Design a protein around this nucleic acid. Sequence first.
RNA 1: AAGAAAAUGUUUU
RNA 2: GGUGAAAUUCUUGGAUUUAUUGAAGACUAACUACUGCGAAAGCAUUUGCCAAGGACGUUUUCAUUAAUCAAGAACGAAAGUUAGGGGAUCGAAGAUGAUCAGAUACCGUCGUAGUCUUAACCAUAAACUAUGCCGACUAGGGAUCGGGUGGUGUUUUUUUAAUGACCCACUCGGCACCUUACGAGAAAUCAAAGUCUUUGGGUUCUGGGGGGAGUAUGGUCGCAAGGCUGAAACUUAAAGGAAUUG
Lengths: 91, 127, 25, 97, 202, 63, 212, 97
Amino acid sequence: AKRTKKVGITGKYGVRYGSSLRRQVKKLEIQQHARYDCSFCGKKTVKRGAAGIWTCSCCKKTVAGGAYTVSTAAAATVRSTIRRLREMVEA
Amino acid sequence: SQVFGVARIYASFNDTFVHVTDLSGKETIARVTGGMKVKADRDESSPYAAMLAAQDVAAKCKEVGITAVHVKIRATGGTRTKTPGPGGQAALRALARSGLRIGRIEDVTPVPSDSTRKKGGRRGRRL
Amino acid sequence: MRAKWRKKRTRRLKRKRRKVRARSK
Amino acid sequence: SINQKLALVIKSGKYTLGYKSTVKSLRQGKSKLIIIAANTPVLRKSELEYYAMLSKTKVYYFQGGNNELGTAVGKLFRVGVVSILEAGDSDILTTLA
Amino acid sequence: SGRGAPLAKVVFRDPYKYRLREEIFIANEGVHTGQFIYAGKKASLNVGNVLPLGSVPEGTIVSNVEEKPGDRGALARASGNYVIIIGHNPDENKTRVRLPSGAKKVISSDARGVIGVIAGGGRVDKPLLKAGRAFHKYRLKRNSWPKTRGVAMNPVDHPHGGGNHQHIGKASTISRGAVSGQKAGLIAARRTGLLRGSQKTQ
Amino acid sequence: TPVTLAKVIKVLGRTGSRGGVTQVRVEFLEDTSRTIVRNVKGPVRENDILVLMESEREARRLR
Amino acid sequence: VVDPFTRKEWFDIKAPSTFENRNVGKTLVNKSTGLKSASDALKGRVVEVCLADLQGSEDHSFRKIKLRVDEVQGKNLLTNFHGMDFTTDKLRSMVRKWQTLIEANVTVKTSDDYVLRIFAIAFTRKQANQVKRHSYAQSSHIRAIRKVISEILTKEVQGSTLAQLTSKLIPEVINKEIENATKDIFPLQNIHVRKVKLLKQPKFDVGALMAL
Amino acid sequence: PKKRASNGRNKKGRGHVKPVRCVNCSKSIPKDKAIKRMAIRNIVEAAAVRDLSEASVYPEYALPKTYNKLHYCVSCAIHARIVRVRSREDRKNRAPP
RNA sequence: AAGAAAAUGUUUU
RNA sequence: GGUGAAAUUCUUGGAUUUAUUGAAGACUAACUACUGCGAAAGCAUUUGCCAAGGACGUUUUCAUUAAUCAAGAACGAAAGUUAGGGGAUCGAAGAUGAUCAGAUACCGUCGUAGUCUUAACCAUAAACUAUGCCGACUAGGGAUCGGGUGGUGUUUUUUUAAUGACCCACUCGGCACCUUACGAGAAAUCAAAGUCUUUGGGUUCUGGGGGGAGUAUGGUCGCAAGGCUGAAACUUAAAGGAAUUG
Ligand SMILES: [K+]
Ligand SMILES: [K+]
Ligand SMILES: [K+]
Ligand SMILES: [K+]
Ligand SMILES: [Mg+2]
Ligand SMILES: [Mg+2]
Ligand SMILES: [Mg+2]
Ligand SMILES: [Mg+2]
Ligand SMILES: [Mg+2]
Ligand SMILES: [Mg+2]
Ligand SMILES: [Mg+2]
Ligand SMILES: [Mg+2]
Ligand SMILES: [Mg+2]
Ligand SMILES: [Mg+2]
Ligand SMILES: [Mg+2]
Ligand SMILES: [Mg+2]
Ligand SMILES: [Mg+2]
Ligand SMILES: [Mg+2]
Ligand SMILES: [Mg+2]
Ligand SMILES: [Mg+2]
Ligand SMILES: [Mg+2]
Ligand SMILES: [Mg+2]
Ligand SMILES: [Mg+2]
Ligand SMILES: [Mg+2]
Ligand SMILES: [Mg+2]
Ligand SMILES: [Mg+2]
Ligand SMILES: [Zn+2]
Ligand SMILES: [Zn+2]
């Protein structure tokens, strides 16, 4: 059965701190506790250690990432920018 | 046997520039505008002001050693008009009559392959 | 009065009425 | 494309899925082609390439990872490497390079 | 501990003695364990590599940028931060860069930086939500928390202290030339109030 | 003051808000193989010759 | 009161080793001094000259050529190919209603080291007996024609040096190759290589520059 | 009533047309509705063709033209007389003058 | 190429 | 610079203009049309991948499986909301110069939010063809898009032939258009708005003089802005449509 309508994981906080702050926290807690696809072994086994460290329970590979998600949009954009600059440099 | 520069007539509304440079464009020779040839703040773009400006520019060009000019005519372009101002035609004519030789007239009005939002709002200038 | 601005005025009135209703208890 | 040839092989030909059976087929000389997923670890890829060059076996590099390779071979599990033992009624062995 | 960004322990061979040298870099996002990092003038433009600023093209995103060649990293070190290379001056070799604060800085072209952005970004987007979470954050940094408001103190304790109401009493904008014990409030403030308008002044 | 004279070879029509100016196609007395259009205030007719303080300024209509 | 033209001296631009005519004109620069070399102020200048002026033939009135000063050799600015572009009037005259405009562009490395983007244009045309008034392509024709043009441009680069490509552009042989390779898809009246853009130059190689 | 049979635009079977900005006042108008005129003006007419030709360094230069497509909003087109108010029956005449 | 300002008018015949 | 004219603004620390570079974000000109696709909103640079779709062709297959639809759902321009990103341009607010009798309006110069994007909300537009959907029939015509058929056809070469493009004829489907209206309509006009007092092909939704009022109340959805549902008291002789002459 669905136990809460909207609070989800932030039902641990009860009525405290304000609904907006609980919602903002909820989004990033879901992100930081999710399992992500490992780019090395292809399994959905990447979980966060401390903020910015994302380790695969299978293949034991750890990658530096965002505080609450494996890859920030800024990092993806930087990866694309560096790829473009490198391709221009090498060709 | 001619020494060539570039005329670079920027004919906007509200002003005209007659800007003679070298063939590269890095080094300039007698940039003259109609705003320095009239003082009314509204005749800045007039064909008379453009003609006087071009006369002065051709004088200084012939004193520097430039005898022929390749012509590049432009409007404001970008998102603003794309239509050359009233003084560009007179500036080109005066450059022709002042003894300078003319070559390769071209329109270099900057035309976007598509642009940033035009100024004025979706209802335009309401006058 | 332009119907759009009449609509705007009516919305403002509805908001104010709801505020006074809620201020009462 | 290559997915259709792979599906035709799965439907008609003979194949083995996985590193251990692929290496067994390579060392037994009954592999006609090995398809390696893009995300296969480079050490395993180099070992498979060495086995393939020892056995004169052709190597194709699947653009996707093991998830996509398993989907392509029609399985609901990840596949790092496919070994084609018999092409069946499919031109996957001849329509390459 | 006390740092938002993760660190990368990177082992290099010692070129002059048979041994390994472990270095503590600040991990750029996307760097993984078992990855080969290349450091030097001839290194490739790949995330995690350490290159001189003059060896990278305009628009490159770098991190842990040296202010001077050989200081081993001063700029864009906090989580999610980076420096942008905005230009080179080969004669009198310098690189113009944009810093996280938006400042433009001219650095020696031999100063190094790590290609990419510092990992751990977005960290400050999560509300702390709790005095206890602020407590545990600062327990591993320094004794700067919690903060008593000066207006809540007595005149002996603070410029803002005292009064039959809590209030500053005089302008909280304090001169740059003020002395120690006076610099409480907004030091050398060019302006105050809710910031309305644009940044990057020309 | 530079000297130049010209002669109306064609009268185009009236112009100006009040119709006081008239447009004339004028041919220079020297170098007769060139024509310019000028605005003249007073009454003009064909083969009537004008003096131009300024030589080369194409007159347009007067709205 | 300074008269900046008294301290300026003239240099002669020698654009090609191959075009038709080396002399394109003159330019001026401040006199070399203790801290500001005249060769430093030169050697980056780009001169855009009409291909008609470069070849002596007016059928090249469009297609301006960019030539950047690469070396200063004793009052002689030796330049090299920097790019080519059509004239705005020619392009606008080509672009008409009631026909399809097809544009292709490729990024390719010349045989020696140069990285270039080639922009080719073509326009559908009516047949000689055509009664229909617009003669549009069916966009699968457009995709096929763009593919053919891309292949032709990619093959003409990568098989030539920058100089050989420059000597191929002048006779417009690539235009005719595109026309013969696309005549069996759609007529394509106005095939042109409208632009060549220099994206990256190799190591300077003054030896290779010294072919004039 | 409905002034114009189709509408004051040309959009049937479309639904939405991207706008253009009036060259005179910048008003946003749907591209199908905008009054569009092409200008092919010679780069120098100015009663100055012969004088430019005399000043020219080339014989028979074939001076170029300036091409500019002008898009007008209805208000600006009427005010500048690119288009004129017509009688009820003349409105139905789509042929240009 | 284009051309500033112009608000108001009681009720019933 | 900007304007009708100005002024705010920038400017001998060199403004504007010119040249060579480089970056960012948005947009996708011209081609572009009484042209295409989509359920609508919408959708216009290239290429690749992923699935989807109409039409046509069919001597393939199933055989009534269908039409329209309370309840219930999906999508749904713009603006707007929340949180990241991005923030070039333009730009609600605001700041400002001018005009003015006032002018925190139009005009001018800046400029926040916004404009873009991601993850969620919102569910509304003159969301328009102000024309529900399905089916049949009733004028003439020429274009045009897609498919197909035919030709002693034109052109393109491959080697007989053949593709492609084009020309002619025909056909199905489509966006439309022109003429006339037998007919319809208050008329404007309409090939549907016709086949309606000679009134019945099937079916869904909506209206019942103008206001009060999309308001009050209740319900429900939404973070909010609000959306959906939705009166009455009371008031009023017109309000309104189309056309005619001034
Ligand atoms: K002016
Ligand atoms: K106090
Ligand atoms: K009365
Ligand atoms: K912005
Ligand atoms: Mg008006
Ligand atoms: Mg007014
Ligand atoms: Mg605090
Ligand atoms: Mg406190
Ligand atoms: Mg106390
Ligand atoms: Mg004290
Ligand atoms: Mg004090
Ligand atoms: Mg007290
Ligand atoms: Mg009306
Ligand atoms: Mg719409
Ligand atoms: Mg009255
Ligand atoms: Mg001015
Ligand atoms: Mg189309
Ligand atoms: Mg385009
Ligand atoms: Mg319903
Ligand atoms: Mg004011
Ligand atoms: Mg602005
Ligand atoms: Mg939006
Ligand atoms: Mg509605
Ligand atoms: Mg409706
Ligand atoms: Mg009623
Ligand atoms: Mg009426
Ligand atoms: Zn893993
Ligand atoms: Zn307008």
